[PDB]
C-alpha cells in the first residue's frame, strides 16, 4: 500500500496543479488536476509524468478520456495509462496550447 504521491513530471510539464497516484488494496489510483502541459498538436501525444520506482512495473494499460482547459473552454483529451506513466493525446482538429489537463483513473495491478 502506497499513500498519495507525486508522479515525476515530464519535461515541458508545469509544476502547478495536482498529479498523484496511490495503491490501496492492490488497485493503482491516478488523479490529475489542472496540470499545465506543453502544446499538443492535432493527433500528437506528449508525456505528462512517470510513476516513481516504488510503484513497480506491473501496472495496468488502457486509454481513457480527460479534458483540456483554458480561458473558460474545455476540450476532449486522450489519456494513456501504462507502466510508462501518463501521456496525453489531442484528438481535436486544432493544436491544444497553454492548456491544463484533468482526469482520474484506476485499475487493479498486474
Amino acid at each position: 500500500d502506497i499513500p498519495w504521491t507525486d508522479l515525476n513530471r515530464a519535461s515541458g510539464v508545469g509544476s502547478t496543479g495536482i498529479l498523484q497516484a496511490r495503491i490501496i488494496n492492490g488497485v493503482i489510483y491516478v488523479r490529475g488536476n489542472s496540470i499545465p502541459v506543453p502544446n499538443v498538436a492535432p493527433n500528437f501525444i506528449v508525456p505528462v509524468g512517470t510513476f516513481p520506482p516504488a510503484f513497480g512495473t506491473n501496472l495496468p494499460q488502457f486509454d481513457s478520456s480527460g479534458t483540456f482547459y483554458s480561458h473558460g473552454n474545455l476540450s476532449l483529451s486522450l489519456i494513456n495509462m501504462s507502466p510508462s506513466g501518463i501521456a496525453v493525446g489531442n484528438p481535436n482538429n486544432t493544436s491544444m496550447n497553454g492548456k491544463t489537463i484533468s482526469f482520474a483513473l484506476s485499475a487493479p495491478l498486474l
Copy 2:
C-alpha cells in the same frame, strides 16, 4: 472483430445520445455521447449499459474519467468499465442530477 454496436441501456437511462462499443484486433473501444443518466449521489454508482453477448466474457476492468453535463456546465464523472458493462460514478461532493454523460475508453481484451 465486432463493428460499432449499441449497448443495451439499463433501467432509468435515457434513450437519446449514443452508447456503443467495437472490437478491432483484440482491443475493445467504448464511447458515450450525451447519454442521459439517473441522479447519482456522491460515491454511489448508477448502471448505464451492458455489452451484447457478441463481445464475450474476457472484458477488462478499470475506472476512468468522463464528464457530467447539464445547463452549459461540465463536471468530473467516473466511468466504471467491467464485464458487467458501463456504470457511472460521482466523485463530487454534491449529487449529479439531470446529467448527460460523455466518455471514451479502450483496452486490450483479457
